[PDB]
Amino acid sequence: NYQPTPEDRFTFGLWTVGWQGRDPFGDATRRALDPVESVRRLAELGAHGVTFHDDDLIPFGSSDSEREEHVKRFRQALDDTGMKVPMATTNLFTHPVFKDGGFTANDRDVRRYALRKTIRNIDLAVELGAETYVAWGGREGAESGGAKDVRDALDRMKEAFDLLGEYVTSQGYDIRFAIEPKPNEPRGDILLPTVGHALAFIERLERPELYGVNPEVGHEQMAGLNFPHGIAQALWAGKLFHIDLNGQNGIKYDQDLRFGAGDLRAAFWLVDLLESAGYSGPRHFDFKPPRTEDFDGVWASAAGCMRNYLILKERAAAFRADPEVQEALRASRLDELARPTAADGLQALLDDRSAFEEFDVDAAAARGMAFERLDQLAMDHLLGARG
Amino acid sequence: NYQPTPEDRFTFGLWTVGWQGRDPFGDATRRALDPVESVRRLAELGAHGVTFHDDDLIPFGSSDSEREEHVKRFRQALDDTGMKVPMATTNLFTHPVFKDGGFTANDRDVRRYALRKTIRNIDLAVELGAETYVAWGGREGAESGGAKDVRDALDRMKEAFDLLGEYVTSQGYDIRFAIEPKPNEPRGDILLPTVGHALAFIERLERPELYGVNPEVGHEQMAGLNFPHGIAQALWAGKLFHIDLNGQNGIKYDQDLRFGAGDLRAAFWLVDLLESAGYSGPRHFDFKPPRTEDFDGVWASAAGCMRNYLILKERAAAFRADPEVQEALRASRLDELARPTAADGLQALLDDRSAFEEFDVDAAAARGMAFERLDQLAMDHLLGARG
Amino acid sequence: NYQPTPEDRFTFGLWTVGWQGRDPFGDATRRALDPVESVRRLAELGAHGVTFHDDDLIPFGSSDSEREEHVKRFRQALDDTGMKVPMATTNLFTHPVFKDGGFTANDRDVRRYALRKTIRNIDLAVELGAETYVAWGGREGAESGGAKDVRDALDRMKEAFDLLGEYVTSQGYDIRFAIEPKPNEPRGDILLPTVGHALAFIERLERPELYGVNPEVGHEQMAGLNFPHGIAQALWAGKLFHIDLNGQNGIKYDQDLRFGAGDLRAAFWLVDLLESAGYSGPRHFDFKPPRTEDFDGVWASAAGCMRNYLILKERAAAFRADPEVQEALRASRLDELARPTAADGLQALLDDRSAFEEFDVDAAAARGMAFERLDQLAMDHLLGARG
Amino acid sequence: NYQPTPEDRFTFGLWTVGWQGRDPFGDATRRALDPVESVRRLAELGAHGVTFHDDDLIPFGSSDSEREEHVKRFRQALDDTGMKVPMATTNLFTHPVFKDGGFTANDRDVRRYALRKTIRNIDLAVELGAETYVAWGGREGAESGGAKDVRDALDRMKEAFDLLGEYVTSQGYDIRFAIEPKPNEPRGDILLPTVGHALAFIERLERPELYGVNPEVGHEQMAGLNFPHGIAQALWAGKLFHIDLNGQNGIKYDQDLRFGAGDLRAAFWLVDLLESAGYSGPRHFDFKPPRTEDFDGVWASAAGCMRNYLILKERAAAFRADPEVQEALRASRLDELARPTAADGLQALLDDRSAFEEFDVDAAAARGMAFERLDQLAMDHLLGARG
Ligand SMILES: OC[C@H]1O[C@H](O)[C@H](O)[C@@H](O)[C@@H]1O
Ligand SMILES: OC[C@H]1O[C@H](O)[C@H](O)[C@@H](O)[C@@H]1O
Ligand SMILES: OC[C@H]1O[C@H](O)[C@H](O)[C@@H](O)[C@@H]1O
Ligand SMILES: OC[C@H]1O[C@H](O)[C@H](O)[C@@H](O)[C@@H]1O
Ligand SMILES: OC[C@H]1O[C@](O)(CO)[C@@H](O)[C@@H]1O
Ligand SMILES: OC[C@H]1O[C@](O)(CO)[C@@H](O)[C@@H]1O
Ligand SMILES: OC[C@H]1O[C@](O)(CO)[C@@H](O)[C@@H]1O
Ligand SMILES: OC[C@H]1O[C@](O)(CO)[C@@H](O)[C@@H]1O
Ligand SMILES: [Mn+2]
Ligand SMILES: [Mn+2]
Ligand SMILES: [Mn+2]
Ligand SMILES: [Mn+2]
Ligand SMILES: [Mn+2]
Ligand SMILES: [Mn+2]
Ligand SMILES: [Mn+2]
Ligand SMILES: [Mn+2]
Ligand SMILES: [Mn+2]
Ligand SMILES: [Mn+2]
Ligand SMILES: [Mn+2]
Ligand SMILES: [Mn+2]
Ligand SMILES: [Mn+2]
Ligand SMILES: [Mn+2]
Ligand SMILES: [Mn+2]
Ligand SMILES: [Mn+2]
Ligand SMILES: [Mn+2]
Ligand SMILES: [Mn+2]
Ligand SMILES: [Mn+2]
Ligand SMILES: [Mn+2]
């Protein structure tokens, strides 16, 4: 059971299963994969689609003709397997030129290079059918306080995204942008470090409707934040355009563990929220098979991502359908949370004596919330111990 | 030297110096302070004014007659000292009735009660001359995943703030609201956990121009975030309405140490920012003298907040005036960061071969940023090691 | 199913279910419990025993006769229910006198008071049949760097524990001490902040055999550390004398959530280790029912602690008995880890050419560890999805 | 002013200034440095000596003939400058063969290979005059719970260190070992994650007198720990054999910033401790110049490490010499902390009614500790704001 199919909309970046195992303290432990091989193996495991950085598909500094050849072989593998490409992105972080950023580099000529590199890949994305374009500003930030004027840096970030909006609009492309936050690493502090910050920024853009977030489980957990809560805020604002699923064990380096690993309960509440809210975008796994693994472990790890999603989905659906849970939800007044506080309006509220002058504060204070019994029903469902 | 004057705009909460020393593990170590005594002593140390929660000034459940007696004695002390009251705030966290929140309590009647409690104190704040009203949603949140539907809770949060805005608009009050974020404590996770999340939420209110943020140094540091970067983003958006200054030693419980303690470098960079940007609001200290101290230590800790601000103000000014610094700032191309990427416009950028096709990537990549030299000049100035 | 009985050796402190809900930002939400009532209710839920601080059982500053009466009523409740008292401890943290510590207070007269208070409760512990005496130095540390000379503080800590060792030895008591570490809260930094630190210290005591650790799940997670790993080190040294079980969501204030909540996977690996290693001490829950709950939630929360242990035990036993897991363990060379590296000795190792001169480094490097498949079998077992 | 001299005992790893700037997300930004060039440039900035991993000096897999050519050119540069080599260490982390560890790899042959690699470099270290040999078990650990039996792994760790001690004992070498802890990265969790855990482990080795710790400022701060407190415990136990000085901004990836950056107050307190205690070992910097820098920044960052040490040394001495400070230290009873609690012995303590029965608890509790005043005097000195 728990067999993935394309109806589940699971996607993987080429850089995930293709990660060669180079870390800051050591060399690669695995050979490079041909993207064609990755397309085929993922199709067989039941994936829906693949994603790419420009540089994962076309080696940096290729001629237009070697570019043509890379894209053509990839497009044939897609046609044979039926795999789609729902999202694309730019590598503005690997090459030494980007050591101080892409869009917010201090040097003007690098910022123009970064925009040109992005625009070129936008054209390619549209040609392969991508509807979301992700931007992760992994080099945008600083190690020291004086290096970056952050107000100037935000003006340059806004500038860049406005230009990109202008481009896609002027070409008639039906693509949207999704900003991916991360708090740190590889910079000491990265600009727009959380879902909140990225949401707030988007509202100051010229055409905010074109822009959303691509939150990553591990990145918000690197700041000690509740990921389902962040996601809920992004859903509430209409801005969850895409998601990166993985695992992370607390506040440390970015681990990119397979989804389900790391904080398992947060994974459950996340799946519950995504499925209850009707999120219909890709379930995209941004993970790295650890460098201990050979290729067989690479595929077992990828298979696990999808497996763990499906198991959590089944348990969250069981939880929500259980009439004992529905009863506990009423006992905890979750239904009362969904009622407006004051649809009667301001004047009626001020005139309502039972809301102040005659409010019996001690009787309300005495009501139990019954949250611990509810949470124990959730645990029982998660663990398959509802006996 | 470094003696505060009331022109420096230093303010303190009543709850700061009046903190009796009760923590989750121990009893009070100091007697309660009469607010009249706080006002007089703060004025003597050179403070500009004081702030209050409703419940600091009028004990919860006071008759109208006691209420007036407390306000009368408070006003006289204010009159006698020339102390201002620039900000006020509501206690929606101490009483058991607020155990599941104020504005986002699952029970509707509690939510209405929280609003009426808040409104009553807005009137009092205006009477005392407050220009800013802070909200800290310390109980708004959860310890478990099922206890709060976060989309509903944000609907209720928005409803509450929209109603408060309608109130102040209809009364003709010149007062603005500032939301104070915190990521956790006393809730497992608190809603709107950081500056970014609060700035994002504001943009969805009915009258966003009336709402800004009141960031607190230690609260952002409890999520491992860079406080000056956060403040820079609030400034960029035009929403820094008030600030809470204190100290914090990394990711742990909310310490509320005196300003200058904790992350000293971040304090330097924050002062540099506030002073460079021309922030003209209060320099409010939200700190607790440690429970090891007697009253003499209370006043020493308070004096130290002001003194460290003034020391850092002088060191930041010396840093910015230093000719070697101005040369380092040019060497690191901070002036280029302040200029547009592409004020020639999108079409010219796409036509510029020097931006992409003919950009000398290896040459740009070799250019050092000279950020370490700059940062050592800043260190030298902070430490008073220049000449 | 999953019904606890005394054979499971589950114990609870009086202060756990008796926690009244006072936190740093608010008042109690529940009435005090009579310890007699707690003994009876826990007995009915299937607990083995209870633990206490001196001050949980005998109000601070009681006369010898009111002391007699408290202890007598408690001893009758124990006799009626058959509940045991396997561990006792001292409150050296609540009373204002201990604001700078007990054993490491700067003031000498407080340190002597702290030792006298502890010794008196040791006698009581022995009389009620306790075999472990826990010390948690919650006030031992500092908020500022100059306040405490830490070498002096360690000399005073050693002094105190040596005196206590001398006492129990001279009385012929068969009780052992267990040091409980915590990294911070309510002090900025607490002395002996982790399991490691406490282990290292114990080796410098006059009679190290009398002393062990009482590690708490949430406390090691407050420093971002792996709790099963810490426990394994404590087991390896022969020093795991007792354990505090609960849950915690990462690096923040001490949450004391019910066991199973917080990091669920770490809970599974913990149970696996305790049951595999044959740990035979109490399974003691140090948790606080959240302040949202009434008394019914208090008992549901306590019941959950034991339930979640039993469910995890069943899944870890299933995991270990699965011949497919046993195969995966061999594939990952866990059996090879248990073989000595060089039982042939130093000279034989230096003379072994296949270990260096002829070691084929590239062939060894190419071996996969197969850890991801093993971990996925663990996840499957935990979630009850081995289909 | 603040010019280092070789008498200040400042040392640097070859890998520090030679770090090429390759991080997990980007390519090298600087060319490799010839170790001869590092030695000469460091000597010019006033360094005392250098340290090396085997693989820094002799590339992995070098013939014996290349090995000798590299050592010969290195020795000549050492001779020419007067530079010492006080410490050496083994790279058991970069090559794929060490992907599951060196001493604790699940495969036995890898463990034997790690030992032989280490032994070969101990000989070379002794030849160059090293008195300390550091071990950093960067690969010793796990990403998942089942992958490592931690009791077995510690048996293997002990075996490895015991063998190294037998080696040095049998050769007659005057060299000591120092274990360098780190909590995580590049492993999910690393074994012996903190100073405490390493100190504890040492006591279980066959010849513990030969083993001490090499703590690193940023590594302890990655667990949110107080570095000066950790150093104080190592000193107390007589085990501070070497130290790594650098900077770190809280709980995240290992930043290895220049010393003085990061937590500046903790740096002040650390210098105060080292200088007060008379630590006579090397002041070793384990830092990486950020990848934004060119070679001129490399040397600036290195010079800055030394300079910040010397500035803080002067400020700590001024603090300790200040008469107002000595008075504050008496007011806070630091002198009483240095004296015994009960040098009258256990029987006298139990007989002393002033210690318990007749102790005036309310009077002792009212005494302020005066820690804030003390700490503001320390702030004033660090900032150079005293007179
Ligand atoms: O979208 C860009 C992607 O770029 C990189 O691979 C980042 O590490 C990953 O977090 C992100 O999702
Ligand atoms: O403004 C409201 C204030 O309420 C409480 O005292 C908080 O702990 C504090 O951080 C906040 O600034
Ligand atoms: O043993 C003493 C006990 O004291 C307190 O209740 C602590 O909060 C708890 O962590 C500890 O287990
Ligand atoms: O001594 C061994 C050294 O090895 C590596 O370079 C580590 O990253 C470092 O922290 C350590 O000090
Ligand atoms: O409890 C009083 C009840 O009345 C309401 O305020 C409105 O129906 C409920 O939300 C609350 O739970
Ligand atoms: O010292 C002040 C700080 O100390 C604590 O009591 C310890 O938990 C906090 O609640 C408070 O903010
Ligand atoms: O793999 C070579 C094998 O030979 C051993 O070193 C000894 O049996 C094993 O531990 C290793 O896995
Ligand atoms: O700037 C130096 C630091 O930068 C990083 O590359 C970013 O991940 C770390 O690996 C390194 O220690
Ligand atoms: Mn299906
Ligand atoms: Mn699919
Ligand atoms: Mn940048
Ligand atoms: Mn990631
Ligand atoms: Mn990602
Ligand atoms: Mn009164
Ligand atoms: Mn007057
Ligand atoms: Mn928004
Ligand atoms: Mn605070
Ligand atoms: Mn505040
Ligand atoms: Mn049973
Ligand atoms: Mn039991
Ligand atoms: Mn102490
Ligand atoms: Mn705890
Ligand atoms: Mn405990
Ligand atoms: Mn060579
Ligand atoms: Mn010579
Ligand atoms: Mn030990
Ligand atoms: Mn490091
Ligand atoms: Mn190091």
Author numbering:
A (entry chain B), B (entry chain A), C (entry chain B), D (entry chain A): 2 to 388
What does the paper say about this structure?
Dehydration may change the crystal lattice and affect the mosaicity, resolution and quality of X-ray diffraction data. In one case, that of glucose isomerase, dehydration triggering a change of space group from I222 to P21212 was observed. In all three cases the P21212 space group was observed at both 295 and 100 K, and cryocooling the crystal caused a unit-cell volume decrease of 4.5%. The structures of the 295 and 100 K crystals at RH 96% and RH 70% have been solved. Ultimately, the data provided here show that the complete dehydration experiment should pursue a wholly 295 K experiment and a laboratory-based 100 K study, as well as extended investigations where indicated. By adopting the approach described in Fig. 1, glucose isomerase was identified as a system of interest for the dehydration experiment and it has been possible to identify the nature of the changes induced by dehydration through the two structures presented.
Another three crystals were mounted directly into a stream of air at a RH of 70% and data were collected at 295 K and subsequently at 100 K from each crystal. The RH at which dehydration triggers a change in space group was tested and identified. Dehydration to a RH of 85% or lower triggers the space-group change from I222 to P21212, and dehydration to a RH of 90% or higher does not impact the lattice. To better understand the effect of dehydration on the crystal packing, the structures of the I222 and P21212 isoforms of glucose isomerase were superposed using the first chain of each structure. The Cα backbones from the two structures have an overall root-mean-squared deviation (r.m.s.d.) of 0.412 as calculated using LSQ Superpose implemented in Coot. This indicates that any changes induced by dehydration occur globally, i.e. within the lattice, rather than at the individual monomer level. The rotation of the tetramers means the lattice face defined by the a and b axes of the P21212 space group is rotated 12° with respect to the original I222 ab face. The rotation induces the appearance of screw axes along both the a and b axes of the I222 lattice, giving rise to the P21212 lattice. Along the I222 a axis the molecules spread out and the cell expands from 94 to 95 Å, but along the b axis the unit-cell dimension reduces by 16 Å.
